[PDB]
Point group: C5
Chain length 235, copies 5
Amino acid sequence: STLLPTDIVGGTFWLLSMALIGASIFFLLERNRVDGRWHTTMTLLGVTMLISAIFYYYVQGMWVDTGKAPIVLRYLDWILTVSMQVVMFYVILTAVTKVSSALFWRLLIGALVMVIGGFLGAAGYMSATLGFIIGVVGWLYILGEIYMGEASRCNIESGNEATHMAFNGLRLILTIGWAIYPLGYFINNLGGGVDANSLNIIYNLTDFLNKIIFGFVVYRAAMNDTQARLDEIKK
Amino acid sequence: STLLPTDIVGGTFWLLSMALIGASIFFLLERNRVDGRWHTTMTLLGVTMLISAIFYYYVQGMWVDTGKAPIVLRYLDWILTVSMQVVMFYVILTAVTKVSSALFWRLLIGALVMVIGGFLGAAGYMSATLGFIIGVVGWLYILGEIYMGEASRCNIESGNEATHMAFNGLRLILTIGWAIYPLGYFINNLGGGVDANSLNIIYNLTDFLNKIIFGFVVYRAAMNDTQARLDEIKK
Amino acid sequence: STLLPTDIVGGTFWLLSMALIGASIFFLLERNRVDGRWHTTMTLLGVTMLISAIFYYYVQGMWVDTGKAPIVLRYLDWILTVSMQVVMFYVILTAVTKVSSALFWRLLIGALVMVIGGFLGAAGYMSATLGFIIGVVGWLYILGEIYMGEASRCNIESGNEATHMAFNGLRLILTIGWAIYPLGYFINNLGGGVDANSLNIIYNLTDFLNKIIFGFVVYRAAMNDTQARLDEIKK
Amino acid sequence: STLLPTDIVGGTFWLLSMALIGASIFFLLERNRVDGRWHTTMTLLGVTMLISAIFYYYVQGMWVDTGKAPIVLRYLDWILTVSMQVVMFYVILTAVTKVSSALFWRLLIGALVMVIGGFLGAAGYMSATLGFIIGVVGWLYILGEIYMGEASRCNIESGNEATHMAFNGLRLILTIGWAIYPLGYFINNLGGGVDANSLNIIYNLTDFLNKIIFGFVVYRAAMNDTQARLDEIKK
Amino acid sequence: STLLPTDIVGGTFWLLSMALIGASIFFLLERNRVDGRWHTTMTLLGVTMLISAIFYYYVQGMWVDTGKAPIVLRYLDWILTVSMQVVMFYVILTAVTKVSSALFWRLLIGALVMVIGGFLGAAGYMSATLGFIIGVVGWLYILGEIYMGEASRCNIESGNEATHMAFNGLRLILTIGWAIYPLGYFINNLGGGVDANSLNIIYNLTDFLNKIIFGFVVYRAAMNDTQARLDEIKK
Ligand SMILES: *C/C=C(C)/C=C/C=C(C)/C=C/C1=C(C)CCCC1(C)C
Ligand SMILES: *C/C=C(C)/C=C/C=C(C)/C=C/C1=C(C)CCCC1(C)C
Ligand SMILES: *C/C=C(C)/C=C/C=C(C)/C=C/C1=C(C)CCCC1(C)C
Ligand SMILES: *C/C=C(C)/C=C/C=C(C)/C=C/C1=C(C)CCCC1(C)C
Ligand SMILES: *C/C=C(C)/C=C/C=C(C)/C=C/C1=C(C)CCCC1(C)C
Ligand SMILES: CCCCCCCCCCCCCCCCCCCC
Ligand SMILES: CCCCCCCCCCCCCCCCCCCC
Ligand SMILES: CCCCCCCCCCCCCCCCCCCC
Ligand SMILES: CCCCCCCCCCCCCCCCCCCC
């Protein structure tokens, strides 16, 4: 009776594909109902989800056919979608306040180091140790920016209550949620190893929570700020 | 001559895929004609149907190829779409009245227990008995909320005639319509068993009625309330 | 040289798929240019065509692979799209006048008896004779409604010239156009029999005319009424 | 290493598919920026291109698999898309002037005779000679209409400079551009014959020019007229 | 461990497909937020990305199946997408200033010579030398136009700060970014030769940067000019 991990692997790939195409359409359709200052935020949110959905459509095909789906495949999605998620901190701030363009590049370059540093270590192009180290340095920058950098100070000075809640929530996703992936990398590569079937499940589930909760956090910020403005217009 | 159950299984998978993509596009296109307070209701309705349509597209492929479509596959759709349907009670109330956000989480957690409780019992991760029990407890919460809870009291105090009709109708779907699935689980798992082909037909037909009637109930509420408002504007 | 019927079967399946996806997009894109009272009419028109297009996409796959496409497959499309076409008489009337909701259910139930009555006779679940009889009773109701029923009286009392033209045109499609299908059923089932290849061609061609002419009749009504109103606004 | 015609055949099928899906989206997205009188013109333009794109998607599949793509397959696209292109002369005139609806039917029937006349001769259902003759008679009508008929006189009396340019340009496409297809038919059927690999290239390239140049001619007319009106509003 | 080039080839085809469908949807959805004078610029930007995404969808299929993806396949995409990118210089200028239509044709013909000149040399229809020479002449025209031609003079006289930034940025892409492709051609054909696997990677990466950076440059111009206008309206 007990379903085999292999069964759960290709099931979760379907789940992820459906959930993310759903979230995508939902965020792209509700982009017309947020104040216009939030339109790019909502367009980037829906397109992030669409990109990830297309990844899972590709991967489910590779699983159905070949029966294998390596973990290095992820760095295609991540190179795209981690980048877009870290940029969301800038896009959200520009919605409500004025921030230097430099924040955009610090954040993006920080994401690119995290993913590329780990890819090089996973693909074999360099020691997985040096892969981990470069990846963690990339992360700790991003965290450094959003906790004690221009992004954090810009948040405080915005005065936007929506942007306060967004930041507090996205920062928590990027700190706890995103800590699964490094862990995975460590155990799989620098450690004993994990069956790829089992690591495909964990990554599939973590993606469900680190992409949906991210999306809903940002969507509530856009919807709450939109309403706040309408309520102040009424007064 | 007599078509074989196997024939009717893969036919109904097509029916369900066509009907649900049709209902999806219809609810997403008519979302621009309802009062704006009903836009999220209509966006969630169309995206629920799209998610289910994508499921049936996946499953029809598995059937066409392998010739088998297990009943545990359903919990991918259900984990997504049951959740969204139970949340519709909150989304509808927030359209017309003021309701605690806590209701959102009581309802969602209630759905997650129902589906996950049954998945664990169907996958083999726990006795199907304990699966049933946990599933039914999850349901009876949801029913408890919408019959004698904050959702029910908020409905009464809304004063919205549309929200009255919606509730009365959705409550009936969730009580009678949704009682097929537990029944299935009982007979298939805790009972003698069903032949999977037969249970795929029943579930395919029940999905047609528990997703279309749900959608049309909610669509009529949004369309009726929209008009009510226009008629009071004219006065 | 002479193309074989088998060649024309899979060709016509492509034709139908293209024509119906084309008509679908055209009716869904032109729904924004008709008076808003015609928006549901145009949304149902485009979604009817989309549902049929998806059917033909499925069937062309079955043909390309298996080389066979049974005639009982049609009742998937028909159960959906015949229902929607018979309801169009109600949706059009509610665009321009006030009609009882009962008409909706008389019409829908009439369609469901027609298709289901014939499915049961085609699938083998009952004598094809009793299938025919139940199917024809279902049709003759629908005709009875639209010729000498509430639908007919509501048309006369609407005073809408567009709704007069629509009715006259749709009632002619439902009387002459739709008489091919019963004929087919009779000859194939109650009669000697028809090669499925030949009957797939006839049904493919009849669908092209009974779905396009239907769509264009309804689209002209919506476009003509829209303009009539603008011309009276100018005066 | 000179690429083989077979290589160029399936390459050009891809080209055509991409170009036509691109033109389709472009015309359907720019339909919102033309004066509303041009909305049906632009909706028919985009849907013509979409229909042809879907054809080429089907055909590329047949090529990739079977390695053969007969030239009689074209008459599926042509029956749809030639009809729509000849009707564009009516749709454009009704945008800017008042024209009898009879022109619509003369033009459509003229197209249907051209394609069907040639199909019957290509499929084998009648002498290719009689196929050619019936096809050319159908064409020469259409040319007769647009050069010396109601379409030509309506153009002159419109006074629309955009409709003058469109007509002059579409007339040239229908006279020179469309003369490739008859030629092909003659050489392939009434003449010696052409390898279907070579005739698929010529037809693929001619479709690229007789569908893109057609589209851009019509799009410039809609965009030029839109602006002309805005410039006269400013004065 | 070290991933094989073959692995990276089909991975990058996925990346490119996802990134370009993402950029496409993003540019087509943000088309509604730029000043209307920028709507064609944004529609051409999104459709360029879509055309390239569809190419990579085709090519990934050819790789997955056949295991080979020749470098001559590229000229299908390039004939379309290079053309559209060189025309963007005209479309952008017409957004903000008055420019002769002749520039459109000089630019387009210049692109067509570049790609076709190289195709003829790659396909074998003429010496790769003469292919290179004709290709480089085509390029050097385009550069000549945009550096010291009507396009450059029109830019200077526009007075638009957005169009200044766009031009300077696109000119840099067309000069440095686009210099990789000629290099490839030279080394592969006129030179020693390169494994197609390696050249597929380089071209895949260069496309990611020469199509995204192009798109973001143009999008910033449209977004910056839109805002500049709003800011001057406020004053
Ligand atoms: C939607 C997918 C997401 C958010 C994935 C997140 C990925 C990371 C945070 C990866 C981090 C890594 C390190 C910090 C160490 C080196 C290995 C990585 C790339 C897995
Ligand atoms: C659109 C699909 C729907 C609404 C499915 C509904 C599913 C349920 C109501 C499932 C309920 C179950 C129990 C109450 C007991 C345990 C077994 C379940 C999960 C089938
Ligand atoms: C778009 C497809 C259409 C309109 C199909 C129409 C189908 C019918 C009118 C079927 C009628 C039948 C009878 C009246 C008796 C025998 C059984 C049927 C279902 C073929
Ligand atoms: C987009 C495709 C187009 C415009 C195809 C055009 C087709 C024709 C003009 C066909 C004409 C023919 C004749 C005039 C003679 C008989 C053979 C035909 C059908 C090829
Ligand atoms: C999005 C794809 C792009 C921008 C591709 C650019 C292609 C070129 C600039 C090709 C140029 C060539 C030459 C200048 C010499 C001959 C060979 C070519 C076609 C590769
Ligand atoms: C000034 C107002 C805010 C505008 C922000 C624009 C954000 C657009 C989306 C950014 C996408 C980032 C790149 C993601 C892909 C990975 C990196 C590719 C380039 C090297
Ligand atoms: C003013 C009263 C309401 C007028 C508009 C009603 C709109 C109904 C549009 C949807 C009709 C769907 C009915 C056909 C469903 C097809 C499948 C039925 C299978 C049982
Ligand atoms: C004021 C009147 C304006 C009328 C506009 C009519 C628009 C018609 C658009 C659709 C034309 C379809 C032409 C036929 C398509 C192919 C079907 C014929 C048999 C192959
Ligand atoms: C063979 C290559 C085919 C594609 C090349 C052409 C693609 C771009 C054409 C569409 C955009 C033209 C828009 C013109 C806008 C300005 C018109 C001048 C008056 C303002």
